[PDB]
Design an enzyme around this catalytic site. Structure first.
Site, PDB file in Angstrom:
ATOM      1  N   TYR A  81       0.977  -1.208  -0.049  1.00 49.95           N
ATOM      2  CA  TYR A  81      -0.029  -0.030   0.075  1.00 49.95           C
ATOM      3  C   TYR A  81       0.993   1.170  -0.203  1.00 49.95           C
ATOM      4  O   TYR A  81       1.978   1.295   0.789  1.00 49.95           O
ATOM      5  CB  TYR A  81      -0.795   0.035   1.463  1.00 49.95           C
ATOM      6  CG  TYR A  81      -2.052  -0.837   1.392  1.00 49.95           C
ATOM      7  CD1 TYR A  81      -3.333  -0.540   1.719  1.00 49.95           C
ATOM      8  CD2 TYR A  81      -2.018  -2.223   0.679  1.00 49.95           C
ATOM      9  CE1 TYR A  81      -4.341  -1.356   1.537  1.00 49.95           C
ATOM     10  CE2 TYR A  81      -3.369  -3.049   0.550  1.00 49.95           C
ATOM     11  CZ  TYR A  81      -4.345  -2.565   1.258  1.00 49.95           C
ATOM     12  OH  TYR A  81      -5.395  -3.331   1.115  1.00 49.95           O
ATOM     13  N   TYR A 132      -9.960   3.210  -2.513  1.00 52.21           N
ATOM     14  CA  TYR A 132     -10.503   3.476  -4.104  1.00 52.21           C
ATOM     15  C   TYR A 132     -11.792   4.305  -3.805  1.00 52.21           C
ATOM     16  O   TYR A 132     -11.668   5.382  -4.508  1.00 52.21           O
ATOM     17  CB  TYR A 132     -10.676   2.202  -4.465  1.00 52.21           C
ATOM     18  CG  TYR A 132      -9.180   1.746  -5.220  1.00 52.21           C
ATOM     19  CD1 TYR A 132      -8.294   2.763  -6.185  1.00 52.21           C
ATOM     20  CD2 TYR A 132      -8.723   0.634  -5.207  1.00 52.21           C
ATOM     21  CE1 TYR A 132      -7.010   2.290  -6.502  1.00 52.21           C
ATOM     22  CE2 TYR A 132      -7.720   0.124  -5.855  1.00 52.21           C
ATOM     23  CZ  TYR A 132      -6.797   1.054  -6.534  1.00 52.21           C
ATOM     24  OH  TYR A 132      -5.775   0.585  -7.126  1.00 52.21           O
ATOM     25  N   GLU A 185      -0.387  -1.905  -8.077  1.00 48.59           N
ATOM     26  CA  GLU A 185      -1.196  -2.873  -8.707  1.00 48.59           C
ATOM     27  C   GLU A 185      -0.558  -3.606  -9.601  1.00 48.59           C
ATOM     28  O   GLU A 185      -0.846  -4.839 -10.088  1.00 48.59           O
ATOM     29  CB  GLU A 185      -2.519  -2.024  -8.996  1.00 48.59           C
ATOM     30  CG  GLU A 185      -3.439  -1.489  -8.058  1.00 48.59           C
ATOM     31  CD  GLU A 185      -3.924  -2.279  -7.068  1.00 48.59           C
ATOM     32  OE1 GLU A 185      -3.620  -3.529  -7.114  1.00 48.59           O
ATOM     33  OE2 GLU A 185      -4.765  -1.998  -6.237  1.00 48.59           O
ATOM     34  N   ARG A 193       1.762  -6.064  -8.094  1.00 49.67           N
ATOM     35  CA  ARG A 193       0.993  -7.197  -7.655  1.00 49.67           C
ATOM     36  C   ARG A 193       0.642  -8.215  -8.785  1.00 49.67           C
ATOM     37  O   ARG A 193       0.762  -9.563  -8.592  1.00 49.67           O
ATOM     38  CB  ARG A 193      -0.069  -6.658  -6.791  1.00 49.67           C
ATOM     39  CG  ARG A 193       0.032  -6.226  -5.569  1.00 49.67           C
ATOM     40  CD  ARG A 193      -1.108  -5.620  -4.862  1.00 49.67           C
ATOM     41  NE  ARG A 193      -1.754  -4.450  -4.810  1.00 49.67           N
ATOM     42  CZ  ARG A 193      -1.801  -3.543  -4.036  1.00 49.67           C
ATOM     43  NH1 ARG A 193      -1.250  -3.610  -2.754  1.00 49.67           N
ATOM     44  NH2 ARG A 193      -2.311  -2.298  -4.366  1.00 49.67           N
TER      45      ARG A 193
END
Length: 262
Positions: free
Chosen positions: A72, A123, A176, A179
């Site tokens: 994060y 988000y 993102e 990942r």
């Protein structure tokens, strides 16, 4: 804490790929993995962070601070004014992690200055600040990233909408993408243009922890329970095996306990 330097202003899909490979290699635990997929480290493994220096056009740079345990973005810094380091901590960072963002991003206590991100990193919060119902309406892209960096870096005042769009694009193209292989590939396919993130990229983002737990817990390649996801067209995609979703995943969130490591 090591920092991965990525030149946004001048790149190629190969350099983007090298960037993500370096970020994944630095973020991942040295040995933790399930089904051959590397996993992020336990919260007390040091270092707890990894920095991402995003060098944009016109000498505009912004450094993201990420927590290795879950990737994060905790906040970011930008060279400000004279020779100052302006650090921005997310509203959802608390306790010691707050002084950590401050001291990690801007190690010189004599020249650092603060400018909080007055909202958390969820988000739905970012989408609200950006004035959109969905982040699908906010296009991603190398040039879009570059432009957003330049709207923030070194600029005294900027609106929450401006900051939110920068955060939306940067989180997705950095965290993102690291990942998910699928997401990296989406960016590489549209490397020279802007593109709207599809239903599969957004779902993957929203089900990462679920996917990671399911893979960690999977017995003999079989997920504990059928996992409902959604493909690129927006259709319901029910996965039953690790082999069915593993091609899309680069890194797994930290999940405690032993697992089938290969």
């Amino acid at each position: 804490v090591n920092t991965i330097i990525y030149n946004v202003g001048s790149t190629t899909i190969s350099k983007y790929a090298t960037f993500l490979n370096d970020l994944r290699n630095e973020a991942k635990d040295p040995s933790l993995k399930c089904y051959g997929i590397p996993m992020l480290p336990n919260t007390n493994t040091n270092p707890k962070y990894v920095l991402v220096e995003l060098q944009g056009s016109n000498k505009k740079t912004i450094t993201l601070m990420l927590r290795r345990n879950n990737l994060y973005v905790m906040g970011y810094s930008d060279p400000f004014e004279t020779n100052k380091c302006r650090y921005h901590i997310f509203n959802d960072i608390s306790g010691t992690e707050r002084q950590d963002v401050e001291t990690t991003l801007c190690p010189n206590a004599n020249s650092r200055v603060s400018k909080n991100i007055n909202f958390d990193s969820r988000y739905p919060t970012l989408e609200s600040k950006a004035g959109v119902k969905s982040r699908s309406q906010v296009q991603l892209g190398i040039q879009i990233l570059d432009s957003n960096i330049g709207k923030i870096s070194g600029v005294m005042s900027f609106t929450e909408k401006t900051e939110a769009e920068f955060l939306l694009v940067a989180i997705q193209m950095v965290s993102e993408a690291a990942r998910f292989k699928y997401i990296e590939n989406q960016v590489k396919t549209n490397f020279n243009r802007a593109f709207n993130p599809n239903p599969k990229v957004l779902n993957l983002q929203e089900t990462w922890g679920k996917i990671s737990t399911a893979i960690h817990d999977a017995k003999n390649g079989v997920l504990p329970k059928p996992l409902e996801l959604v493909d690129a067209s927006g259709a319901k995609w029910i996965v039953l095996r690790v082999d069915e979703i593993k091609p899309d995943v680069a890194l797994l969130n930290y999940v405690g306990g032993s697992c089938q490591t290969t």
